Write a protein that binds this ligand. Structure first.
Ligand code: CA
Ligand code: CA
Ligand code: CA
Ligand code: CA
Ligand code: CA
Ligand code: CA
Lengths: 165, 163
């Protein structure tokens, strides 16, 4: 039912639009730090929650375009130890391993780096959805080509360069 | 010089720095639609001494140049002359930049950068369709030693590559 979500479209008409472009949602969600929500994280929710190849959602899926963030906030929250809204190295060693991951101490300090901008050694939330789902899959295409049962895959200089994208 | 006139010519307020989502307005890609904001970001952020996300006259002089040349490529490879480029003309394009890419990963490639679905890379997608194209041929080419191209990559060792 769209009436349950009709007041959500009210805030989303700076240019009357009706269809949700990338920023057409940006003002409906916080990242946890007073900054805007990174569009790179946004298009992950639309091109993934819309069949139409133009990046703009609707009822058929917006029942869930949002729903995934309501999926994602529970986890985040049910891990925040400090409740300060950020996950640390000690903290991620528990969340990652909550997702059935057997990595090691040394990767449990390599991950944080791409996403911790401020440089305090913690992940905000706009850094979480994006890149979480990205990594949620680097166990997955790493899967499609070679299950060595120790992790090794490889191809030549040829279209293996094509794979890297 | 004549650039002294061309720089204000797009500088709406006399500000003396071209904005980003102001330059989207001078660069025409010929889809009669807008020029890619993302191509517009790369063109600005590439050439910015600072974080200002812009180019003043003492910072744009070259962007103009980098722009010029980016057409001067189109202009050659667009042999048929349709303001836009197709698979048969994209082929000699990627190859001319030295890419050993076989037919399958072009329909693939075009399917990530042809902004409209006509199978016709326009002037704005191409540049963009060459910024990342390049970027991910770089470190790999740095990473693979024997230039045969195979890389044995372990679980926790590999993960940290496409990052
Ligand atoms: Ca709208
Ligand atoms: Ca915490
Ligand atoms: Ca200006
Ligand atoms: Ca000609
Ligand atoms: Ca042509
Ligand atoms: Ca090698």
């Amino acid at each position: 039912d769209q009436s349950f979500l009709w007041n959500v479209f009210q805030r989303v008409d700076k240019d009357r639009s009706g269809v949700i472009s990338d920023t057409e949602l940006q003002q409906a969600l916080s990242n946890g730090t007073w900054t805007p929500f990174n569009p790179v994280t946004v298009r992950s929710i639309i091109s993934m929650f819309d069949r139409e190849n133009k990046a703009g959602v609707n009822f058929s899926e917006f029942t869930g375009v949002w729903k995934y963030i309501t999926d994602w906030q529970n986890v985040f929250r049910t891990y925040d130890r400090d409740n300060s809204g950020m996950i640390d190295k000690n903290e991620l060693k528990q969340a990652l391993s909550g997702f059935g991951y057997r990595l090691s101490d040394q990767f449990h300090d390599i991950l944080i780096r791409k996403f911790d901008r401020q440089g305090r050694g913690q992940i905000a939330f706009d850094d979480f959805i994006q890149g979480c789902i990205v990594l949620q899959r680097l166990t997955d295409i790493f899967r499609r080509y070679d299950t060595d049962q120790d992790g090794w895959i490889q191809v030549s200089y040829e279209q293996y360069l094509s794979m890297v994208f």
